[PDB]
């Protein structure tokens, strides 16, 4: 925290809650995640 850089961030899905180390471990699981939208409406 004092030398170096403070904070972090990493690709976890905000669809159903899952990290990954690698970004596109991500990429390719938005594959499964189809529904980018409303559906009552
Ligand atoms: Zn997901």
Redesign the pocket.
């Known amino acids: 925290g004092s030398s170096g850089s403070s904070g972090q961030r990493v690709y976890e ?1 905000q ?2 809650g ?1 990290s990954f180390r690698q970004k596109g471990s991500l990429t390719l ?1 938005e594959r499964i ?1 189809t529904g980018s939208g409303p559906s009552s409406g």
Do not use: I
């Open positions: 899905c669809e159903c899952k699981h995640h």
